[model samples]
Target: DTQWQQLTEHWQELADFGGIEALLGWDQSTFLPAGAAEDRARQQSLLAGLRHARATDAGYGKLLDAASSRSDLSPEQARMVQVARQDFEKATRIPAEFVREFSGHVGQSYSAWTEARPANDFGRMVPYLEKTLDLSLQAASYFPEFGDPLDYYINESDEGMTAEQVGQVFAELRAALVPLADAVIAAGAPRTDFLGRGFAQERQLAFGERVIRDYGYDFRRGRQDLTHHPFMTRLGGHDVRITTRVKEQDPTDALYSTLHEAGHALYEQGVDAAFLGTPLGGGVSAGVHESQSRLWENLVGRSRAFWAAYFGDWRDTFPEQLAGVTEEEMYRAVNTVSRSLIRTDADELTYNLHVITRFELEREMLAGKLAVRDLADAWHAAYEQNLGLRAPSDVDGALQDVHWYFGPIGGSFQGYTIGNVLSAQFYAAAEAANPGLEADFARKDFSRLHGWLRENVYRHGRRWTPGELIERATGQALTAGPYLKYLRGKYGELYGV
Candidate 1:
């Protein structure tokens, strides 16, 4: 009992450091001045080193070992120690200095990207990206159990998913989606002439907050901010924050971004209080986390039921911009399919194509089949081959996403498409278990859906592996059949395919 208490306190302190690290990153992205980047990078590196030292401390290891040897531990306590042991093993394999250096390098790279991407200067970022790739490979080298670097990254992100498994699933998805995308594009787009009529950014922001509030985002515990890229971060167990970007010419840009980030925040917020500051306190894996974001953003936010509930208020918010627009028109406009360059802005059908293209590029670059110097051209070429469109500039091509520029390249993207697949799967199960759930959306009541997911998926936190979570919640293993069916049924009806 004494050892358990000590272990709990130690884990909580580690969790506190994790939150501090995230706060630094959150501030750097949102409110930090450009000139402060250098100092902030150094500060982050120093903090990372401090955290690493504590995480790998001899006494901490001893405590964990002592806790692990106890057979009388409750199942929950055993899982907690087991998780901490896994994290400790992973952290100890890499030196603290290496962790500090990598953290510092990524900080500098991220700051540089903020300037270079807008200037459309991929050349300036090439050296930084090259170093990042090198470091990523070196990091993976410590885990030779997963020989390929991509496999290491995949396993790190999704836990138990292999590169082979992801590649096969992505291939099947691409084969089905390409034809679906082509057919949808051929059917022509809905009337979106009103969407770019200069809707006010403030109103757009407020409107999204209102919708997510109805979806149970818990504003008292969390809030939203503006940033170059939209994301959600947990500053502590209770203080989840989200950031979004707004375009005055397009209301959907800000609205969907808010909804997406709020989805992430909702998952973090819904975690049971008992697990806070412990190993099981957060979402289990990247894929499972992404599922919640995609679920709320796409499956719920963009549905006909959603518009049925909020369209009147939306139209009221921008009476001049939405003049003569029917709710059906608004729904179809939001769901328009096209061959697009921006992954974040791409409609549902073409979004996975963007992810698959990047996933392939990451693989080719890591394998030495493609060089960083040639990555811009490769990006354009790949876009042409995959999406049937080539970006006119590298700004929209290789420089669009902040992922490869700010962090390692391999594992960051697959969760998006995986989440897309799981979003539909989880939604289908929710609908099966609770009839009239969609009808509740029409009434602007999301408690039934939210409560169901909170009980089944979110509250458990990381107690279960992602596969176990999926099987337990949905009564089967993860598959793309539901996602594919959703796309075909929804888009097929929309485009008469």
Candidate 2:
């Protein structure tokens, strides 16, 4: 028991450091001055090294060995100790020097990526990306239990998910989705004249914030800000934040981005306080985290019920721009199926194609079939093959995402597809559990859906795997059927299929 106490104290201290680093990273993204990037990277690198040293300390390992013999702790305490031991074992497999270098490289690479993306120069960031992939491959090699290097990265972000599982799910989705997308495209032309017109950025932000708050994100516990790419970060159990970016040329970009990040914020804000400072306090996986955000952003936020309640507000906010557009027309216009240069701005039906393209390229890159220098070309080739569009530059191509530049190569694209699958299953479960869920959305009352998620999914934390959590929440196994069916049913009606 004494050894167990020491182990708990040690791991908790590391957790506190992690929490501080998280808050600092958030501030750096949201409010830090541009000139602070160098100092921030140094601080982050030092903190990461400290955490790595603490995580892999031999004393903690000896304490874990002793604690395993003495079995007098409570069940929660036992679970905590076990989880900490697992983390330590994993950490020890990698060198602390490598951890520090990787952290520092990623921090600086992210800054370079931000600068190069807007400048449309892939050459400016390619060296950092090469180093990132090399480090990622090295990281993957540390866990030899996994068969594929990409599988190791997948497991790093999400447990119990293998490359085979992703491939299987995506294959099923492709079989169902391609035909449906073709149907939508052939049914008729999308009303494009309604979009691409100028819309004020300030009004878009105001409307986005209003919609997120309506979905049960408490501003007292969290806040929304602007960033190049929208994300959600948690400072602590009580402080969660989200970021969104706006485009003056298109209003729907900010609208959906806010909803997406709000979904992530809600999950973090709703995490069970009793599990704080422990493994159970974290999300089940990055894929599961994506599910929560995609469920709200796409499944609910883009639904007719959601628009019915907010279309009037949108009209009022931009009366001069959308003067004669009916609510139904506005709803249809926003959900139109069209090829786009940006993955984030892609239509719902074609979004997963973007993810699938990345998955293929990363798999090849990890398998040594592709070179880092050819990434941009490969990215464009995949896009043209899958979605029939070509990126004009690296900014719209391989350099668009921050994942590969941050040593998250194989983990980059899985979340979008996984989120698509989980959203349908979660929504089906919510509808079955709360028969009036859609009615509540129409009434602008998200408590029905939000409360259901907190009770069923968010509060459980990492106590369950994604598959187990899906079964517990939906009372069924994970499948692509619900997602494809939802897409077919909705788009069928809209495009007159």
Candidate 3:
């Protein structure tokens, strides 16, 4: 009883401060002024230091140490204790000053990236990149148990993956995708009439609101705003927020951006009421969280059935932009393939390729195999080799992604590919459970799919591990098979492959 009692108490304390931390983070990102970046960093780092000290305090450590022996806990309670204890141990290994320094560097680095990305300034980032590399190794030094230092960062984002295994899976996917991408191009592309043309921001935002509402995003609880990069953040128990970047020239950019983040918010909003305020609240892992976003945005939001129902709305909304674009043309256009300039905008066929490049680059940089000065060339070369596309400048090249600019590099990128792989596997299993799911979309009825995810995936929150929940839902370890099947079947028909 004592074991279970204080573990919950400490977590509530941690969770209370966590809301403050997340809110401050959202502020720094959304509303914090340029002049305040350093001050914001100082404030956040100090708070983070206090929080870590509490989490790793000797009192909390004692509660966690004996928590393992308490067989009186329910499986759910046991799991909560398990994860909470795990955090305490990791926090123990990391020093408060070290965390403060890393977090401070993050605010400074993020501000720097926010400026440097658009200015096409790669040189401005070299010192930051070198520091990032140094700090990453320094952080990795805390976990002396791992033989390879790189695993620490990789596991930070993707819990179960190792460098060698992730590489093998990536290599398998790359081999399949390259030839498929070539075939799609060789077969000629979709001639979509003005689907990519400019639509007013008012028009884009309104339509996005409607789509996500049907996808079951609650506007009352969560709201969407514009930002340089699209993201979803949980500000509090009652407030989950998302931001999207818009290109008036392309409506899908904003529409899918909203939907993608809505997927993330939906997961947060759908968590069991019982899990709220406890350690169990929120998603299980980065990969699982991404599964929902990618699932809704791609598997459901991008599908033909989605367009079958929405094309009429689109035509009515943007009468000029939708002129002469048939339902089939619009579907194909959204799914069309080419080496894309931005990862967020890449077509399904080429999406993972961008992730793989970052995965490789992160590893190269972390291992000292690549230098900061050479990253722009490395990014350019990877794009040319993998996608047959070249970024004309740093803005479009390495700067296009915010990961390295925002945080420790390697911990940031791999989860995307993991999320992609899990999204399909998760969706396929959902389809098996609901016969009317695909049919439901044709009539604009998303209840079955949305309800299934809420029941099976979203409601559990952090109560289960990704693999445990994934295998329970889908009946397999994570693999490329379901994803490849989805891609091959959809694009094979589209491209005559």
Candidate 4:
């Protein structure tokens, strides 16, 4: 158990530095003053250097060697050592300089991106992106077993996922969803005019809080705040935060984003408390995490039952804004299928298409088929080809996301599409298991579905892989059938086709 002790000690050191990085990241997003950007970058870089040194310490290999030699360690101790060894091996493979530089660049690049995106200047972000891709390719080369460089990056974000797997899922989804989307477009459009009309921010926040609590996010352990982009982050276990951006002209923007991020908060809140400070404490992967959020945001939150239940509250909150809109009209408006520029704000049916476009571009870049300089052109081309739309600016285009700015060049895009497929599969299981689930949502009761997720999915943490977890929760392999079927059925109803 000496090796286990050594591994834990090393992790403890790494965890402390990591915790600081997390806090700094949260501060940058939430509380950090504007002028502190330069100082924050230096602090982050110093911490990154210390983390890299500890992670790649030669002592880690010695500890791992000792742990492998021991035959009598407890299962938990063995797992700890084994996981630590894997981390050490991977860390040692990458040059510390590479890690430090990328970490530093990410901090600065993110700040630049924030400014550049608003101005729609891809030129400002171009150099930072090129550097990120270079580091990513270098990192991928250190793990040749990954086959495709983008695949390596994809697996970095979500264990056991590959570019090919993403393609297969998206291809299946496209076949089913494209036709449904076309039908919806041809049939008619929703009355979303009510959404963009003036609504008070305070009222929006109040409603968002009610929705979050109803969906089971404990406000005592977490808080919601406004940001440019909505996201959920866990400080650790019980300390999770959800953020949303409000546009006074757009009610659906904040409302749905709140639900989306609340879905993420719910998963973090439901993580196995017993496994805190361990890998098993977190959700299985980013894809699965997105599945929970997309499920809640799109599959349930946008559903008719949800609207029927909550439209009254919305009406009461903003009677002037929603004076003439009925629950069914609001439901149709939110669910309007369209080819859109922004992925986060995309209709559920076309959302995967946006992810697929990113997946294609990332694959091309990693395969050396496309250069970083050409990313903007490539992104615009894919949008036109796949979704029959074009971004008015980089803000709505390639630069819309914070993923690439954070060194997640190839890893982040795959999760959205994967989540789309999994959301339906999980929802189907939820509906089957709890026959009264929709009715309960209509009655403002989400406990049935929330309990089902807690018991079947969120509670498991990393104890299962995505495949194993999907099977255990749904009693079958991952499939596009449920997702495709649900989209087709829902859109067909809305569009009357």
On lDDT, the candidate that comes out on top is 1
Badly placed stretches (over 4 Å) of model 3 are: 1-6, 33-38
What ranking of all candidate models by lDDT puts the best one first? Answer: 1, 3, 2, 4
Superior by lDDT: candidate 1 or candidate 4: 1
How many backbone clashes does every candidate have? 0, 0, 0, 0
User: What would you estimate as the lDDT of candidate 2?
Assistant: 0.83
lDDT of each residue in 1-497, candidate 2, tens digit only: 56656765786687688788988899888888989877887787778778777778888788877876666866766666676677778888887777777877887798788788999888888788788888888888888898799999777777778899889998888778778887888887656565677889899999998888899999999888899878888777677889999888888888888999999888888878777777567787887888899999888998999988998888898888887688888878877887777787778888888888889898998888998889988999988888888988888899877778766567677877888788888988898889988888888899989999999999877666678888888998778888888999999989998
Give candidate 3's error at residue 452 in angstroms.
Answer: 2.1
What RMSD, rounded to one decimal, does every model reach?
1.5, 2.3, 2.1, 2.4
Ranking by TM-score: 1, 3, 2, 4
lDDT of candidate 4 over 1-497, digit per residue (tens): 65566666676667666667777777778888989977886787777777778777887778778877888887655665666666778888877777777777887788798799889999988899988888888878889998788888778767787777778887888888888888888888978888877999988999988987999989888898888877888775568888999888988889889999999889878877755666456778878899999999989998999988999998999898888888888888888777778777788778888888888888888778999889998888888989998888778888877888976578667887778788889999999999999889989999999999999998877767788889999998878889888988887878898
Residues 1-497, model 1: lDDT tens digits? 88788998998999999999999999998999989977887787778778888899999999999999999988988998999999999989987778767877887898799799889999999999999999999998989998798999999999999888899889989999999999988888899999989999899889988999999999888899999889999999889999999999899989999999999998999999999999899999888899999999999999999999999999999999989999999999999988888888888989999999999999998898999999999999999999998988888889998898778878879988899999999989999989999889999999999998999899999988999999999998889999999989999998899
In order of appearance, the predictions have TM-scores of 0.97, 0.93, 0.94, 0.92
Among residues 3 or more apart in sequence or in different chains, the pairs in candidate 2 whose N, CA or C atoms overlap within 3 Å are: none
Residue-level lDDT tens digits of model 3 in 340-361 = 7888778887888998998888
lDDT of 4: 0.82
Whole-model lDDT values for every prediction: 0.91, 0.83, 0.84, 0.82
Task: Give the Cα-based TM-score of candidate 1 against the true structure.
Answer: 0.97
lDDT of 3 at 492: 96
